[PDB]
Amino acid sequence: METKEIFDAAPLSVSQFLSETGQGLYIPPYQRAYSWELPKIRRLLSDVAHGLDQLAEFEDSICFLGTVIALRDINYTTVEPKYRSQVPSKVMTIIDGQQAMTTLLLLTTVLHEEIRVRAEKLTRDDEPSVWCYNQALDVTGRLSNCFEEDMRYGEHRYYPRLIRSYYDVWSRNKGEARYRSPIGYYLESYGAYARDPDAVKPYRHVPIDPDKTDGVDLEAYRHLDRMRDQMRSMLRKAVGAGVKREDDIQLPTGTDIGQSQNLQFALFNSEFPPSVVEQLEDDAKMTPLTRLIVFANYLLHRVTVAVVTAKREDYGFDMFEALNTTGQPLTAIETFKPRAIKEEGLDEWQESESKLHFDVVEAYLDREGSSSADKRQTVTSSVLLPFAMFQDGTKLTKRLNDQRRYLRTVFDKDPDIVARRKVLAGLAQVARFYEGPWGSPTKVPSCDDATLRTQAGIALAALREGGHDIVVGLLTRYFAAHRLSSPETVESSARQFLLAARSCAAFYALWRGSFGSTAGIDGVYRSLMTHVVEEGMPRFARFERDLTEVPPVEALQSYLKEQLRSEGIYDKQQWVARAAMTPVYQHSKPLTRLLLLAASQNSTPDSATPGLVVRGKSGLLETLELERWNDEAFATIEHVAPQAPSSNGSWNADLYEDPELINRIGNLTLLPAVENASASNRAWHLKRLMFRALSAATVEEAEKTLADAEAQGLRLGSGAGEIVRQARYLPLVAALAQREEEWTAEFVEARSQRLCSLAWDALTPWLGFEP
Amino acid sequence: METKEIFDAAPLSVSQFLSETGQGLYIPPYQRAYSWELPKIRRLLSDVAHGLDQLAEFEDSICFLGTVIALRDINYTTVEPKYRSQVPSKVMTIIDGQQAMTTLLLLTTVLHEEIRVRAEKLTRDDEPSVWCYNQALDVTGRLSNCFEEDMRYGEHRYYPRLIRSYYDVWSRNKGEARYRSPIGYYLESYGAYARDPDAVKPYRHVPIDPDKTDGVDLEAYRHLDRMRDQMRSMLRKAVGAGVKREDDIQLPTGTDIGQSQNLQFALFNSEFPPSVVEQLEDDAKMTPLTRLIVFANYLLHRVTVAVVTAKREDYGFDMFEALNTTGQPLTAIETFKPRAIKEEGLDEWQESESKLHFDVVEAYLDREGSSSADKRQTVTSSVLLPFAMFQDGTKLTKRLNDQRRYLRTVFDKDPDIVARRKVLAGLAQVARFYEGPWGSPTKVPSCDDATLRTQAGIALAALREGGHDIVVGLLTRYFAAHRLSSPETVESSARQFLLAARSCAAFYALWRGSFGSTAGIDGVYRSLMTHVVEEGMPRFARFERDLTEVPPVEALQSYLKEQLRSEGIYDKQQWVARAAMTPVYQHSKPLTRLLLLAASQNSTPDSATPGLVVRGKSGLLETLELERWNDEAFATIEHVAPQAPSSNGSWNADLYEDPELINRIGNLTLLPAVENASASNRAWHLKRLMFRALSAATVEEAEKTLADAEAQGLRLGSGAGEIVRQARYLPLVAALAQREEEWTAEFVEARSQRLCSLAWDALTPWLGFEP
Amino acid sequence: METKEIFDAAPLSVSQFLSETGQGLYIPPYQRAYSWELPKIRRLLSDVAHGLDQLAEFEDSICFLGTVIALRDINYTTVEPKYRSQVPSKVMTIIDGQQAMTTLLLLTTVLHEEIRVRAEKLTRDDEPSVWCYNQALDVTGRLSNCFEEDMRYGEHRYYPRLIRSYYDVWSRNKGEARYRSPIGYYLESYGAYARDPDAVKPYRHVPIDPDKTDGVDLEAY
C-alpha cells in the first residue's frame, strides 16, 4: 500500500478505447444528462480536423482529446439495474468525461452513416473507385465494432457502449433488455439501422417513446438527437459545396490527401495507388467520400484520450478532485520567451534589443491582460493573429499548441540574429499599434493633411468597432514603416499609412455593404498578403525581408479593386443594386453608421423628391471625420418605421411582408439625442414631427415646432430630453421632415437606393477608383 | 504510433517521488516564480493533517496531493546552463505542479528542522525516550535525503532538488555550481545547516546576495523565505501551546496516536511498545515530538502525488491542456441520491416518501444554487453542515469526501427504512427552514402572541446577518415539530420554536458581547446537541428517534444558562464588566445593532446625568420587533467620536489611548437617514448639533435647529439629505443632545456601562433568567 | 482475474535492481546452499566482461545476466524468524536465481575492495590521478549501497541484502539481529570492513564460528 494500484493511466486511440473486445462504457447513476451545446461540439470536430490537417505537415503530431477517469467496476456493483447472467466482462463506470464520450460515439455514428451511403453511390468498376469502395468498407466495419459489440446470441444480440444506469440494461436475452437512455436508445436504433440488409438509404431516426419512457425529460432526447444530426450536417457540409463559411470544419482536400505521403502511411499503412492520387487531384465524384474516410481514420487511430482507471469508487472520486486542481497553462508567448533568451546571444541579455521588444509585448500583455488568466490568453491571441498576418501571412488559430508551434517556426526561420530580433520587433510594433490608434484613434500618426488625419481616424475607429481585425495585420505592417524610415521619409510613411487606413475602411464598407457578411474578406486579405506583387521586387506583408521596406502605398488599392471585380461587383449600378437590398442594421451597426456618414457627406435636402438627399456643396459639412464618428451630436441609428409594431400603432404594412425592409439604409438616419430611452419615437406622424423638430434654421421655429409636437405628446417620458434650443444641422432628417405623403415601402426602396449611391460616390475615391 | 509512450503516469508517495536515488527535479525557464500565498499553504498542511486524522479511523484511506506533469528530459535538452559531466542522471523538468513541489520541499525542510532539534532535547536514558529518539533519527534522515542528494565527491558534493533554469547549475565542482534561485538557495543552505556537526540550534537563515544575484526580484527570496518560516511556525503552533485558534492545523494528540493500532502499523509497520503509549497518553514532554514525527511519516509515505511523464516537451504541454479540461466534480448530495434510490425499496420509487424529501432538497439546491457550479457546492454545504448538527450532532467539514462519508454513515445506521427515510426527512426539513424564516424572517410560524412573532423575527433576522449559523441545527430541529404535530399541539410547537429563536439571539447577544469571539459557542452548541438530557426520555438533537418528538421547549434555556456560568460570567455586574470593554463595532455590526435595540427598549433620555438613558415605560415604543430591525428609521451605527480624525478636527485624544474605545457601545447610537453619505459628521459640536436636530419634539424646534446647525453647516455635501420636517423618536439621540461638557473617555465608559446594563436587563428575560 | 497480476516482469540493471532504496532480498528456507563451482563464476565474469568489450563497438549492445523469479512478500509471511518492528519495508524472497544473486553481491564486494584499496594508493595530486580518485569514490559508494543498506539507527545499523531464512534476521537492534548464513555473514563482515575508518588495507576475512554455527555445514562457509 503506497502505489498499491490506487490508479492507472494510459493513452489510447479512440479505436483502442472504444472497440475493446469485451468492454462496456457505463454512465453511473449520478451523472447529469447530455449537455454540450453545439459550440463545444464544433470545437471538438474542428480540433480533430486541425490535428489531421497538421498531420500532413508533421508526420508524428498526435492530437489529444482529454481525459476519461473511470471505475473498473469488477464486481458490477455500480451497474444498478443489472443481469449478472450476462453483463459485459469489463464494465467501466465513467466518472468524468462521460460527456465527451457520448459525443464521440455519436460522431462515429454519423461518420459511419455517411461513409456507408456515399460508398454505395460508388461505381464499383473503375479500379480507383473499387479501392475507395474497399477502404470505405474497412472504416465502416471499424466504426461498427466501435459503437456496438456483437455478443453472440439472442434477440438484442448487439450491445451499445455508453448506457446510463436506470434507463438501459445490457442483456442479450429477449425479455429484460432495455436501451432507453438518450445515448442508449440512439446507439441501439442507429446500430439496428446499420444492420438493415437492403439498406443504403441515409439514416432517418424514429425518436423513442412510442408510448412510454418519461424516466428522462423528453427534452434530453430532443437535445441528443439534435446534436447527432447537426454533426451529421457539419461533416456533410465540410466536404461538399463551395459556400465554405468561416467556421465550418476544414478538412484537407482531394489534392491535399493525394499528395501527402505521410498522411497516407500513417492512416492507411501504405502509399496510395497512383490512379487514386490522380482521381483525387481534381475531386472527381469520389473525393468527398475519400475525404470522409481519411477524416474517419484519423479519428480512429490518431486522436487519443487519456484513460485513468481506479479500482475503488471513492479513489476515483478523490482522483477527479485531484485533477480538477491542476494549474494554469501559459500563453504561447510565455513558453516561447526561453527560445529567444537562448539566442541573445547566450544568457547575457538585459540591454539587448530583444529584451526591449519583449518588454514591449510583455507590458501590453500585463496591462490589458492581468485581470484574469484566460483574459491574458485572449489578449495574447489578439496580438498573435495580427502578427501572423504581419510577419508571415498565415491564419493563426485560437488553440494553444498552434501559437506555440507557429511562434517556434517563425522565430527559427532566419537562424541568425538581427533578423530574428526583427521578427520580435514585429510583435512589439503590433502591441504599440494597439496602443496608438486603437486605444483612442486620435493619435493615428502626425503629418499635416489635417483632413487626412481625422479621415483615416474615422477609418480606424470604424474598423475597430465592428470586427475586422483581419486588417490589423496590414495596418501594423504600415504603422511599422512610419517609425522605421530615414528621418526624411517620415511624411511619405505617414501618408501611405493614412491612405491604407482609409482604403481598408472603404473596402470594408463596400464588401460588407453589398454582401451580407464577412464572407470572403478574411481570406481575400490573406491572399493579398501572400500574392506576388511586381515580379520579385517585394511581397505584400513583410515576409522575412526587412520591416521598413515594402509594399508601396497603393498596391493595396489596385489589388482590392481588381478583386472588387471578380465576385465583388464595383460599378455603382451593380454595387448600389446589391447594397440597397441588404439589411445593414442586422449586420454591423457601425457599418451602417459609416454608410450613413458617407451618404451625407456635405449633403443637402432634395427638393425635387421630398425625402431624398443630394450632394454638391464640396465642403458644406463633411462628415467623414473622426471627430464626427464619436460626435454624439448625431449618433443614434433611428429607424423611420420601427421594428416593433406588435398591434400596429398604425403604419403601412407594405413595409413588413419582407422583414428585411425595416433594416435597410433607406429606413435609417442618424438622430441626435434620444434613441428609445429619454424622449423618442411613435407612429409615422409623431415621427415626422420628431424629425421636423430637429431641422429648423431659426429658434422662432425650433420653439414653435417643439410646441407643435407637444400637442400629440412630443415631451414623452417627462418633458423632452435635451430638447429646448437645439441648433445642429442634419441633412438626412431635413429631407425626411419634408416628406408628407406616407411611409411607403417603395419609398424606402428608392431612398436606400439614393443613400447607397451617395455613399458609394463618397467613398470609392478611397480605393482611388478607375477600375 | 498509437500509445507510443506519448505519456506515462503513476502514483507515488511523496517519499518515493522525491527521494529516488538519481533524480533531479528541474523548474524550466518559463515557470513563474514561487506564487502560493499562505492560505494555500495552510490548505496543504491541513489536507495532509486531515489525511492522518482520517487514517486513524479508516486504516486504508489514502490521501492525495494533486498532479505533477514533467518531461523526462533524456538528452538534457532543457537544463539550460549545464555541465553534462555531471548533470544528474535523471532530470524531470516539471511542466506543471512545480509550485506544489516547491512547497513540499520547504515542508520537508521544516519537519526535519523541528524533529531534529526537539529530538536533541530528548533525555536518551528512559526506554520510551530512546524509542522516540531512534524513531526521530529514522524520519530525520529520510526527510534529509528527500530534499538533497549525496553525489559523492568535491566541494558542492551535495545536490538540491528543484533548481529553476538560468539561475542554478547542478554540479559538484569547485567553481561552477550555483544555487541562486529562491529554492535552489534555500535547499542548499538548509541542507548545509543540517550537515553542520556541532549544530542542534534551530535554523536561523541568511538570505542570499552577500553582494549579488540580481537576475531575480529580491522579493522572490522574501516571499519564499517567509513562507518557509511560517510553515515552520504553523507546525510549531500545532503541537505546542494551548491557544488553539479556529484554524491552526489539527493533528492527533499523544493519546490519539498512542491508542490507534492502525496509525502505528501503517506508519511504523508495527505496534508501539507500551511504555511509549503510556508516556504518550499524557503528552509528557515527548509527545509533541511524536506528533511531529507521525505527521512527517504520514507526509512521507501516505501522501501520494500523481506523476505524469512525457518524453517530448510538446506532448507535455498538450497533456497539460488535456488535463485542464477535467469536468466539474459533483456535490455530495448528487453522488448520494443513488444510494437511497436503492433502498426505496428497489428501483420502483416515484411516489415513495424519500422522493418527496429529495425533491425538497433538490429544489432548494436548484433554486439558490444554479448560477454557477462552486456556488452549487457552496449551497450544498450550507444545507449539509446544519444537517450534520440536526440528525447527528457533528461538525462536518467543507470538504467533499467528508460530506460523502457522513451522508453514507448517517443514512446507513438504522438499516431498515422509515428509520432511513426519516434520516432523509431531516435534510428536507433543513431546506425548508432555510425557506421559511431565513429568506424573509417575517414568516416565522403561526400562533398568536403577536409579540412573540416579531420578537423571534428580530431574533432570526439578527442571527442571520452576522454569522452565527451554528444555531441552524437547533432551530430546524424545532421548526420540524411545528409542521409535525397532532393538530391540537400546533400552538405548543409554534411557541417552543419562537422562544427557541429568542433564546439563541439572547445567548448570542450575550456571548460575543462579553467575550471577544465565538470562542466556545460552536463547541457549546455541539455539546448541547450531544449531551444526554433527562436520562432516557429523549436526546437534544433528533438522533434516530422520531422527528415530531423532543426535546422540550425550555431545556435550551436551562443548559444555556448553566453554561453561561463556567467560563461565561452572567451576573449583570460581571457581564457588564466584560461587555463595557469589548469593541463590539470591531466584531459583528449586527451584534451592535442587537445590543443597541435591546438597550433602548422603551428607553428614555436620562436627566440626572446629561446623556445617559433610563428605562421604565413598559410600552413606550418597544424596539425588539422584526418590524424594527429593517426599520431604516433608526438604522445607522453612528460613532459619537469618529474613527477618522487623522489631524484632529479637534476632539479629545482621551478616547484614543486605546484603539478599542472608539468602538464600544458608549460611542455608538442608532441614527436615521445619513451615515457619512448624504449630509454628515464633523467635530464634537457639529456632532452635538446633528444630534440636537433629530430630537426635536416640535416643528418650531425642528426648523429652528436645522437652521442653527447650517450656520456651522449641517447641510454638508449639498443641502442636508432627507432633512426637513422629521418627526421620529430616537430616545438615545436626545440624551446625547443633552450632554454639553465635552466627550470624555470617562463618560464614554460610564455610558457604555449604562447601555450594557440596560440591554442585559432587556434580554436576559429571553432565557427566562433566574440563574 | 485473467491477468489480475498473476506475475510481473521487467528488466533492471544490477544497480537499480540491488540498490532499491528500501528492499531486502531473502533466500527462502528450501533453497539449497551456495553451489556454483568456480567455472560458473568464471563464465559469469567473462560474460559481463565480453558485454563490456562489445559496448565499445556497438554503442547500444546491452548485456543480460539471466533471470530472477521472486515473491514480493507483502505481509512478510516467508521471513521465518522475523522482527516485524523493523523488517525491511519491501522483501523479495527469491524463488529462482538466488545463486546468480549470491554471486553478484559477492562480485560487488570484491570490486569494491579492489577499487577502494587501489584508489588509496593514488597520489592525489596529479590531475588524472585526482580525476581517478573521485571516480573511484563515486563507484566505491555506489557499490556499497549496492550490498548493504543504512537503516538509520542502532548497532547492526546496516542491513545486508540476501539473507536465507532460519539463519539471519534483519533487525537493527542490539540483541535480536543475526547473520550466520554463508552470505549473510560475508556481507555483514565485508560491510563492517568497508566502513572501517583507518583501513585501506586489503580485506582479510575472519570466518565465523568463533565458537558456534553448525546450523549449516561449515563446508558451505
Author numbering:
A (entry chain A), B (entry chain D): 1 to 771
C (entry chain C): 1 to 221
Paper passage:
In the PT-based defense system Ssp, SspABCD confers a single-stranded PT modification of host DNA in the 5′-CPSCA-3′ motif and SspE impedes phage propagation. Notably, SspABCD coupled with SspE confers resistance to a wide array of phages through unusual mechanisms: (1) SspE is a dual-function protein that exerts both N-terminal NTPase and C-terminal DNA nicking nuclease activities to defend against phage infection, and (2) NTPase activity, including GTPase, CTPase, and UTPase activity, is stimulated exclusively by 5′-CPSCA-3′-containing DNA in vitro. Here, structural and biochemical analyses reveal that SspE is preferentially recruited to PT sites mediated by the joint action of its N-terminal domain (NTD) hydrophobic cavity and C-terminal domain (CTD) DNA binding region. PT recognition enlarges the GTP-binding pocket, thereby increasing GTP hydrolysis activity, which subsequently triggers a conformational switch of SspE from a closed to an open state.
